């Protein structure tokens, strides 16, 4: 069987860059039966190049495709924030058909801050016997952050989950949710509950806070 | 329209059958292989199945052989994967596929082989107040909690607001359930006059929810 080796795994670059992309195969893939796709969240692969360096309809010149026998390529040759994706090779000159495993290509741009909001648990979630706190950060760059939740000034641990969106194709930013989950009796034994954010775009970390039943 | 649409995912008991449909619009069906690929959850595409114009020649990857059958109605335009002994490592999104100098490729339809049981989800509002407020605009959201299995679908206002929307993904809870926010950002000013309504569909339970997000009342704000 004839296996994929993409490389690399992950490439992050500015718009007006060129990206490369590898893909190197177990065997030699006689005719030229190698196909490029460009995967973005929620969606179908979409072809780019099929049968090496051929470009299909309606794909942008700035995508094309080298290689034979054995390595092949894939150029992006100037990226926009909209090409950010996931890229496969596969191979259609034996079965199994077969995929690489993928290039993720992030696009980076200046840092940017995030806003930071916070949420008290609703009443109405409250009623049923535990309580959810929100965290938001909104619209930053790059991916990195930290998030800490403090209870009456004590650091929270094990009780929270993180969740941040995939790179947004205009504007190339993140966004994150922290929730902190606690059962409503725990949540009625303590009164200031405290989000801190640590960024590269803020100037030292922030902390959004808020007291139980306050309005 | 030249188009492919699958159908008849969902979740299946481990060991349990599913049948999946793919029906083509748009171009002659009968001169082309047709082909099932999968992906899980995270991960990359793995080739399914092939299917020859007529039928006659079928293709299978060995982790599906024996278990899955690929089949065409020509004359019907469909293209099927019978599953059989469906087993964990087949819980997928799967795609039917055209793969010619032009690609067409169906919406994807996902598997989900499981024994845990359906559940829809509690909706709560995450309510904008000035806690959420930044010069001029407010964040606000709904807290979709509690589901199983995945997905469920969040609009605002019916679809009509899209602009400034972040749904969040899916985590699994310890508890093994679902759990994500939707949120969205809108101008601060208006937050007294204009509705906002988050829209939860989960179409694994049949649940809709409209949830109505309604501003915090605040009195330790400045005055006025």
């Known amino acids: 069987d004839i296996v994929l080796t993409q490389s690399p795994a992950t490439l992050s670059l500015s718009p007006g860059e060129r990206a490369t992309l590898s893909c190197r195969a177990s065997?030699?893939?006689?005719?030229?039966?190698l196909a490029w796709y460009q995967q973005k969240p929620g969606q179908a692969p979409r072809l780019l190049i099929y049968?090496?360096?051929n470009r299909a309809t309606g794909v942008p010149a700035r995508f094309s495709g080298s290689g034979s026998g054995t390595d092949f390529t894939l150029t992006i040759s100037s990226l926009e924030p909209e090409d950010f994706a996931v890229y496969y090779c596969?191979?259609?000159?034996?079965?199994?058909?077969?995929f690489g495993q993928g290039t993720k290509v992030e696009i980076k741009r200046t840092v940017a801050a995030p806003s930071v909001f916070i949420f008290p648990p609703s009443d109405e979630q409250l009623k049923s016997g535990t309580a959810s706190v929100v965290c938001l950060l909104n619209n930053f760059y790059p991916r990195e952050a930290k998030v800490q939740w403090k209870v009456d000034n004590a650091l929270q641990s094990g009780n929270s989950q993180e969740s941040v969106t995939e790179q947004d194709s205009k504007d190339s930013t993140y966004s994150l949710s922290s929730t902190l989950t606690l059962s409503k009796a725990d949540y009625e034994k303590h009164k200031v509950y405290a989000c801190e954010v640590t960024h590269q775009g803020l100037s030292s970390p922030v902390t959004k806070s808020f007291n139980r039943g306050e309005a | 329209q030249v188009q492919l649409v699958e159908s008849g995912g969902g979740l299946v008991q481990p060991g349990g059958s599913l049948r999946l449909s793919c029906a083509a619009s748009?171009?002659?069906?009968?001169?082309?292989?047709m082909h099932w690929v999968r992906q899980a959850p995270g991960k990359g595409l793995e080739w399914v199945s092939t299917?020859?114009?007529?039928?006659?020649?079928?293709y299978y990857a060995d982790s599906v052989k024996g278990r899955f059958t690929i089949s065409r109605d020509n004359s019907k335009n469909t293209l099927y994967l019978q599953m059989n002994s469906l087993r964990a490592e087949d819980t997928a999104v799967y795609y039917c596929?055209?793969?010619?100098?032009?690609?067409?490729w169906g919406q994807g339809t996902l598997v989900t082989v499981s024994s845990a049981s359906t559940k829809g989800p509690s909706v709560f509002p995450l309510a904008p107040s000035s806690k959420s407020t930044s010069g001029g605009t407010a964040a606000l959201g709904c807290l979709v909690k509690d589901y199983f299995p995945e997905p469920v679908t969040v609009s605002w206002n019916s679809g009509a607001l899209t602009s400034g929307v972040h749904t969040f993904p899916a985590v699994l809870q310890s508890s093994g359930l679902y759990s994500l926010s939707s949120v969205v950002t809108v101008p601060s000013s208006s937050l007294g006059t204009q509705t906002y309504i988050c829209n939860v569909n989960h179409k694994p339970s049949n649940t809709k929810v409209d949830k109505k997000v309604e501003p915090k009342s605040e009195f330790l704000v400045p005055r006025g």
């Open positions: 596929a055209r793969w010619f100098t032009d690609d067409i």
């Open positions: 748009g171009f002659t069906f009968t001169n082309y292989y």
């Open positions: 299917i020859a114009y007529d039928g006659s020649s079928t």
């Open positions: 065997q030699s893939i006689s005719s030229n039966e």
């Open positions: 049968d090496t360096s």
């Open positions: 596969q191979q259609y000159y034996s079965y199994p058909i077969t």
